[PDB]
Ligand binder design. Structure first.
Ligand code: HEM
Ligand code: HEM
Ligand code: HEM
Ligand SMILES: [Fe+2]
Ligand SMILES: [Fe+2]
Ligand SMILES: [Fe+2]
Ligand SMILES: [Fe+2]
Ligand SMILES: [Fe+2]
Ligand SMILES: [Fe+2]
Ligand SMILES: [Fe+2]
Ligand SMILES: [Fe+2]
Ligand SMILES: [Fe+2]
Ligand SMILES: [Fe+2]
Ligand SMILES: [Fe+2]
Ligand SMILES: [Fe+2]
Ligand SMILES: [Fe+2]
Ligand SMILES: [Fe+2]
Ligand SMILES: [Fe+2]
Ligand SMILES: [Fe+2]
Ligand SMILES: [Fe+2]
Ligand SMILES: [Fe+2]
Ligand SMILES: [Fe+2]
Ligand SMILES: [Fe+2]
Ligand SMILES: [Fe+2]
Ligand SMILES: [Fe+2]
Ligand SMILES: [Fe+2]
Ligand SMILES: [Fe+2]
Ligand SMILES: [Fe+2]
Ligand SMILES: [Fe+2]
Ligand SMILES: [Fe+2]
Ligand SMILES: [Fe+2]
Ligand SMILES: [Fe+2]
Ligand SMILES: [Fe+2]
Ligand SMILES: [Fe+2]
Ligand SMILES: [Fe+2]
Ligand SMILES: [Fe+2]
Ligand SMILES: [Fe+2]
Ligand SMILES: [Fe+2]
Ligand SMILES: [Fe+2]
Ligand SMILES: [K+]
Lengths: 156, 154, 154, 155, 155, 155, 154
C-alpha cells in the first residue's frame, strides 16, 4: 500500500510545521523560565510537548504510507524578545499551521485517504485550542495590562 | 558568560538537535519494520538527547547567550539496521570530539560548572557508544538475521 | 435510510463476515501447528471483525434496512504461513476499497453518522494492513523459519 | 597533611560562607518583619544552604590537618530595602564565585582533586543562587517593585 | 519601639549566641574528626540550640525597631583537647548567664516583660547546658579521662 | 580506542584494588577470629568497597578495548596485631592515592574526562578510608589500645 | 590443626582465588560483548567462589593456620565464548581433583569437620561442572550462533 504522493507531501509539510513549533515553543518556554515567569514557561513547555506528539503521529503515518519522513528541513523559528512578541509569534505560527492543515485535509478528501484526514483533523482541533489559548492571553494583556499579566504568570 | 564558551555550548546543542531527530526517525523506522525492541531503545536514546539539549539551553540562557535551535546539521539516516547503527555511532564519535574541545575551553577560562555539565553529557554519550559498538559486535557474533530476530519483540 | 447507503453497509458487512471466518480458521490452523503467537493474534483479528459486523448490523436496522448475514463470499484460505498472511492482506485491500466507495456515498447523501462509523472501521482495517505488511516484511528480513520460531510461544 | 595554600583557600571560602550565613539570615528576618514572607522563607533557605557549605569546608579542613577559621567575620552587606538587599546578596555571591575559581585552580595545580570536586559542588550551588538573584532583579524591572513585593507577601 | 538600653542588652545576648554557635560547631567537628562521635553529636545539638536562640533574639530586636548586630563576633574559646573544650564551653556559658541576668534586670526595670520572658527561657536553656558541662567534667574526674572518651566514641 | 597509557594507568589502579581486596578481607577475618567483631565487620565493608572499584575499572578498561590484568597480584601488607593491621591498611591507601593522582593527571592530559571522573570518584572513597584509618590510630593514642579493642569487640 | 590439612586447605583456597578472578573477568567480557545472560550467570559463579574462599579462610584461622591470599596461580582466560567455557571447565576439573585429595587427608587424620566443609564445596563444584558440560553440549546441539543468541538478553 503506497500512499498518494501528494498526500505524503502534504503530511511532510505539516510535519515541517510541527518541527518549527517544537523548537520555537521550547525556546520560548526556557526564556520564560529564565525570566522567572514560571507559569508561562510551564504552559509553553506543554505546548512544545503537544507538537512533539503530533510530529510522532505524522512520522508514523508517513512511514505506513511508504513515504520518507523529512526531519532535515527546519523552517524559520519566530522568536520573540518579550512576552507580548513571543505570544504573537506563536499565534502567527499557529495561523500558518492551520492554513496548511486545511489544504492538506482538502487533498486527503479528494483522494479518499480518510484516515489521513481524520489524523489531520485531530491535529487541527489541537491547533485551534492553541490559538484559543494564545488569543485569550493577548486579550488578557489588553484587559489587565502587561505588568499584571506577567505577575499572574510568575509563580506556578 | 565567556563568548567562546557560549559558542561551544551552542555547538554541542547543535549536535544534540541532530541526534534527537536522527534517533527519533531511526526509532520510528525500526517500529515500522516490526523491530520493536530496537525502536524502543532508539526512542530512549532520542529522549536522552532531548534532555541534554534542555540543559544546554538552560545553561546558555543563564550565561546570557542566545541558544541556537534554528540551524539543524546533517542527519545521518541509514537504510537498514546495520547502516542505522553505524550512522548513530558516526554521529556519537563526532559529538564526543566536540565535547572534549568544549571541556578544554571551559577549563581554560575557569567555567567549571559548564565543564561539569559537559562531562555529564560526555559520560552519557560514551554509554551510547558502548551500546552501539556492542550491537555491531553482536551482529558479527550471531549474524544479522538472528540479531534482528532478537529485537523483534519487546 | 438511504437505499444505496444500506446496500453499501450490507456490502461492508459481507466483507466482515468473510474476514471473521477466514481469520478464525487461520487462527485455529496456526494453533494446530503450534504457532501460538500467530494463532492468538489472528484470533484477535477475527474478534475485531465480529465487533465491526455487530456495529454494521445495528446501523442497518436503525436505518430500517435488512441486514444480510446469508450471503458469504469467498474465503481466502492459505496452506502455509506466508500464503495465509498474503490471503489476509488481499482480503483487507478489497475491504478498504469498498469502505472508501461506501464513504463517498455517505458523504454525497449527507449520512454523516454512517460515514463516521465506516471511517472508524477503515482506521481499524488500515491498522490490520500495517500489521500484515509488517509481518511479510519481517519474513523477508529474518527469513521464514526465524519468523515462525518467533511466533511459536506466547 | 594537606597543601598549606589549599587549606588557606578553603579557609577563605569558609570565611565567605560565614559572611553569607549571617547576611542572608538577617535579610530573611527583615523580610519576615516587613511581612514579605515568601522572600523571608526563600532567603532563610539560602542561609541554610551556606551553613551546609560551611560544614563541609570545616570537615575538609580538619581532615587535611588544618585549623578552620570561624573567628574572622568579614563585612556583612546589609541592604535597607528589598532591591538593595538582593543587590547586596548578588555582590556577595559574585565575590564568592571569584574566590572559588581561584581555589579550584590551586587544587588542580597540586592534584587535590577531592578538594576541587567539593569546591565545584559549592560553585554549582552559588551559581544557582546568582541565577535566583539575577532573576528576581529582572522581575522587579519587568513588573515593577510594588507588584514584585506583592507577589512575595504570602507563602 | 523598644527601650534603647533593652535593645542594647538584646544585641549583647545575641553577640554571646553568635560566639557560642561557632565555638560549639567547631568543637563538634573537632570531636567528629577525632572519632568521638557521641561528643560531636551532642555538641552539634548545643550549637543548633544557640542558633535558635539567636533567631528569637533577632526577631525580637526587629519587632522593637532595633538593628540586630550580626557583624561583631567576639573571641571564640577553642580548646585543644576534650577537657579544655568542655571547660571553654563552660567558661563561655557562665559569661552568658551573667549577661542574661543583667539584661533581665533591665527588662524588669522598664516593664518590658515580654523581652524578660524571652531571656528567662534562654537562661533556662543555658543553665541546662551548664548542668551538662559540669556533669561531664565531673564524670572525667570520677571515671578518668580515657574511660570518659571511650564512652563517647560511638553513638 | 582508549589511550594506551590511560589503560596502563587503569590497570595499575586495578592492581592496587586487587591487593586491597585481599589484604582487607584477610584482616577482617583475622579480627573476626580474634572476636573483635566490630573491626572485622568494618574491614569487610572496606574490602567490599574495593571489589566494587575493581569492577568499575574492569568495565572501563574493556570499554576502552584494553585487557584488564587480574593476574598480577602485588604484595599484601598483613599485620600481626590491630595497630599494625591499621597501619598496613593506611600505608596501602597512601600508595593507592599517589597512583590515582598520577592517573588523573594523565587522563586530563589526553582529554579522557570520563576516566578522570571515575578515578576521582575512587579517590574520594580512598580519602574517606584514609580518614577512617587515621581516626582509628588517633583513638588508639587517645584512649589506649585495650579500650580501643574493647570498643570494637561487639557489633 | 593438622599441618598437612592446613596445607590442603590453603591449596583449595588458592584454587578458589584463581576461579574468583577468572569467572569475574569472563563475566565482564560477556557483558562487554552484550551476552548479558552469560555475563550474569558467570558473575554468580564468581560470587559462589568468593563464598567458598571465605569459608576456607575462616576454617584455616580456626585451626591456627595462616591463610595464603598472596599466591595467585594462572588464570585461564578464553578469547571467545566456547574457549571461556572450556577454560572454566578445565579449572573446575582440577579443583575437584584437589578437593578429593584434601578430603582423603582429612579422613586419614580424623578432621571430619574440615572434610564436611570440603564435601560441601565439592558438591558446588560438581554443580558448576554440570552447568559447564551442559552449555558445551548445547553449543554442539544447536550451534554456536544460536547458543549465543539465547544468552544475549536476561
Ligand atoms: C529542540 C528539540 C527538542 C527538545 C528540547 C525536546 C525536549 C523534550 C523533553 C524535555 C521531553 C521530556 C522528556 C522526559 O523528561 O520524559 C520530551 C519528550 C518527548 N519528545 Fe521531545 N524535544 C525536542 C524535539 C523532539 C522531536 C523533534 C520529536 C519527534 C519527532 C520529539 C518527541 C518527543 C516525544 C514523543 C516525547 C514524549 C512526550 C509524551 O509522551 O509525553 N521531541 N522532549
Ligand atoms: C547567625 C548565625 C546563625 C543562625 C541564626 C543560624 C540559624 C539556624 C537555624 C534556625 C537552623 C534550623 C535549626 C532547626 O530548626 O533545627 C539552623 C540549622 C543549621 N545550622 Fe545554622 N545558624 C547560624 C550559623 C551557622 C553556622 C555558622 C554554621 C556552621 C558553620 C551553621 C550550621 C548549621 C547546620 C549544619 C544546620 C542544619 C541544616 C539542615 O541540615 O537542615 N549555622 N541554623
Ligand atoms: C577481582 C577480585 C574481586 C572482585 C571484582 C569482586 C567483586 C565483588 C562484587 C562486585 C561483589 C558484590 C558486592 C556488592 O554489590 O555488594 C562481591 C561480593 C563479595 N565478595 Fe568479592 N570480588 C573479588 C574478590 C573477592 C575475594 C578475593 C574475596 C574473599 C577472599 C571476596 C569475597 C566476597 C564476599 C564474601 C562477597 C559477598 C557475597 C554475598 O554474600 O552474596 N571477593 N565481590
Ligand atoms: Fe501541532
Ligand atoms: Fe494539495
Ligand atoms: Fe480518528
Ligand atoms: Fe500547536
Ligand atoms: Fe494563566
Ligand atoms: Fe547528547
Ligand atoms: Fe575552544
Ligand atoms: Fe555537576
Ligand atoms: Fe547520545
Ligand atoms: Fe472489519
Ligand atoms: Fe455508491
Ligand atoms: Fe463517531
Ligand atoms: Fe480487518
Ligand atoms: Fe510478532
Ligand atoms: Fe520471554
Ligand atoms: Fe555557599
Ligand atoms: Fe592560590
Ligand atoms: Fe564529588
Ligand atoms: Fe550562595
Ligand atoms: Fe518568587
Ligand atoms: Fe544560647
Ligand atoms: Fe542595663
Ligand atoms: Fe512566654
Ligand atoms: Fe548554651
Ligand atoms: Fe554521655
Ligand atoms: Fe568504631
Ligand atoms: Fe579502592
Ligand atoms: Fe602517566
Ligand atoms: Fe561521574
Ligand atoms: Fe580503600
Ligand atoms: Fe569453589
Ligand atoms: Fe595429603
Ligand atoms: Fe556440614
Ligand atoms: Fe566453581
Ligand atoms: Fe541458559
Ligand atoms: Fe538487545
Ligand atoms: K496583583
Amino acid at each position: 500500500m503506497k500512499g498518494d504522493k501528494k498526500v505524503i507531501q502534504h503530511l511532510n509539510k505539516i510535519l515541517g510545521n510541527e518541527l518549527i513549533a517544537i523548537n520555537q515553543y521550547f525556546l520560548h518556554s526556557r526564556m520564560w523560565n529564565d525570566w522567572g515567569l514560571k507559569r508561562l514557561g510551564a504552559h509553553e513547555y506543554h505546548e512544545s510537548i503537544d507538537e512533539m506528539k503530533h510530529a510522532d503521529k505524522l512520522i508514523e503515518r508517513i512511514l505506513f504510507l511508504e513515504g520518507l519522513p523529512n526531519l532535515q528541513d527546519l523552517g524559520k523559528l519566530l522568536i520573540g524578545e518579550n512576552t507580548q512578541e513571543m505570544l504573537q509569534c506563536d499565534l502567527n505560527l499557529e495561523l500558518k499551521a492551520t492554513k496548511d492543515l486545511r489544504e492538506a485535509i482538502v487533498h486527503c478528501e479528494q483522494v479518499h485517504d480518510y484516515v489521513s484526514r481524520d489524523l489531520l483533523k485531530d491535529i487541527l482541533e489541537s491547533e485551534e485550542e492553541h490559538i484559543d489559548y494564545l488569543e485569550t492571553q493577548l486579550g488578557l494583556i489588553q484587559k489587565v495590562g502587561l505588568e499584571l499579566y506577567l505577575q499572574s504568570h510568575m509563580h506556578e
